[PDB]
RNA sequence: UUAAAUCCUUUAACGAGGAUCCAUUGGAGGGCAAGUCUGGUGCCAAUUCCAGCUCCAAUAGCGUAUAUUAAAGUUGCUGCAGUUAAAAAGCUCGUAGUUGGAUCU
């Protein structure tokens, strides 16, 4: 492996540690194998949907394929990729490499009384795409992930244990039931919880404080 | 939009009424016109007496030859068009027999292959269709 | 006008989905090594775990000094304690939530005879509990359902009339002894 | 964020905008991360010191990123009052 | 029979798997009673 | 053969799908 | 046992190798659990009808018809809609109804 980007000169040599320090400054990924050197060793894919869109041409019509994948190490970390291309192999190729680029942390609640690990969404998100709704309800411990299969795929790899799931709009598509499902993931951070009230200590950032090294 | 006042059940209460009429689920069951037409009168079998023996075409996609019954239903009279399993099934029938007759199941709707025929024969002289075609039983005649 | 009783339940609820293959195979792995007979004994576990957690989660959600969460709070985690699924230290309504099906179904007293050395497999332990070769007590069981509290844990005998027991011989012992 | 017991039982805990108090997902890549030097008191060189400012990336969006930092530096003895 | 075919080749477009066309394609198995 | 039914069949279900 | 019986429970005797003391009912080669199958029957290779095999599911049970509930946020109080898809009155005034600014220790 040759690290072409400067993040990945900065985590082929051990100076990152790990994988949060990069979703904290929401540093933009640029490589597959920045995911694959952290926690790679538990990254389980699932090819959900091969949907291809038709143009016909003057010699026939041109079948090229999109695939919908799904990835994730079961513990709070999980992604979706879309990639169109022209065969089944080069698709799922493409598709589990555009996959590796947007894993998203989720964050985990508890239903009451907070014991042990936390098990659920920490509270009622919604995801949205296309007309169709997800909502994600958080559950006592043990209950289950009640759901559709294309979200109970989804929730088991973000590792969330229980959860209350309702949707709305037309569901068939596959595609955008999928996609609604990840928005109501990946939106468990980007909503403000009392418990996270407390004034922001800023860290340095890792661009900063390795300049010596970038240098070389 | 709707009205949300406190005191506004009586409105609330009185257009829910109306309203449930225009589902045309609703209206069958509570109008009671239709079950007055439907032939079974409500029931879920009907026996009645086989007038004669005939042939319905199929659908213009799927070209076929099926052969139902006319049977008159006992207890009001009405004729009805059923069909047979199959065409090695109507050895078993012959005219003025009394034979059962159940609906075909989807509530009132036709085959999603043969239009014109809603009903299918269950029993014929007090013995099954089953039982009959897989040997079980012999019919008295 | 009868002098009869008409009350009676169902102990099991069949699935909404009926062929998944997730459920399918949770399900097969739960008869493998507990050996029982259908997918019934599998729901009837579970629905009766199900009931145990509406009623944990109806507790929960009243106030801590309610006197009817204090009464049957206690009341409910006593009984699960007494059949052996919960520890002595974990008494408290949060923990009913952790419990599974295999916590249940470990108390039956199939199970207790294949772990307590009576027989040599779990469909062995089976057929010797239905063929009345075990005691609880002073009583012969044929149940293998029969869920073992703690106190009849180190009391599951072998039932003295057995052949396996006392030592009277079967038929087919006796009937080959007499061709010679 | 904590338990009952008093452990920290989470992966994270994500920076906020200094302006609108918004948490900064992790995939929003349009935030920005201020280093602004400050200067000796009687010599104006610079010592080290610094304090920084971070603005999330709905608000640059917006446009309203300029009056963002000069707001807080404002109050942050950078910028004089006499502005 | 030929309904079932039209069917197949439209999921076909769509481009979920189907199993291969063969002469079991479409064939009543049996009488319903 | 015959085949079996009841407990032995499921037990036979198990190994063929589970163990091997 | 019981009014007298029966059943259950307790027990003498006999009672299992293909332990023939033989478990069914449905569905699959177009979607959910399960098929690159076999043999008869005929149209100009495709194709009407019939009998089987293999597999799947539940199991002393399992199909079918009909009524009804949930699925149904397709009757919507919680909780739906009305540009182009079903749908907002041609315009205004107007009884009942519904709703009604701030202010008092």
Redesign the pocket.
Known sequence: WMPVTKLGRLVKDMKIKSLEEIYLFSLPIKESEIIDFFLGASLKDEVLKIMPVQKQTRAGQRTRFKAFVAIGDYNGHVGLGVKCSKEVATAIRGAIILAKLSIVPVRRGYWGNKIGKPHTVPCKVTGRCGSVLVRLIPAPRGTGIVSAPVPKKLLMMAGIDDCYTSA?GCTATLGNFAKATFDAISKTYSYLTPDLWKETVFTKSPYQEFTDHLVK | ????????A???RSH?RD??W??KQ?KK?HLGTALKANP?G????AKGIVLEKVGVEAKQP?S?IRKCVRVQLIKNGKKITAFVP???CLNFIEENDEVLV???????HAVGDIPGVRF?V?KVANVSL?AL?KGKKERPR | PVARSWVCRKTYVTPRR????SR?DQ?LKLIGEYGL????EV?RVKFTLAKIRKAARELLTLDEKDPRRLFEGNALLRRLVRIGVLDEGKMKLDYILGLKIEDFLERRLQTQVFKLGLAKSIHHARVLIRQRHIRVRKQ?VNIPSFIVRLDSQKHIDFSL?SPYGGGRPG?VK??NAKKG | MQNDAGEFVDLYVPRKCSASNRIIGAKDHASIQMNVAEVDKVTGRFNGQFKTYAICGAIRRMGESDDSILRLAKADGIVSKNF | ??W??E??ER?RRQGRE???????????????? | ???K??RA??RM?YNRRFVN
């Open positions: 709305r | 939009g709707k009205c949300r006042g406190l005191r506004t009586r409105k609330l829910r309203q449930k225009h589902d609703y069951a079974f409500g029931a879920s079998h799927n076929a199959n065409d090695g159940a609906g075909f199941g989807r509530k009132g299918k269950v089953l075609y | 009926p062929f998944e293959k399918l399900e007979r259908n997918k019934r729901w012969v009339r038929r006796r009937k | 029979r030929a079932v075919l069917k197949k999921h189907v199993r291969p066309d063969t002469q079991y394609t479409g064939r009543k198995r049996k009488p319903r009673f | 053969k015959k085949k039914t009841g069949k499921r279900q």
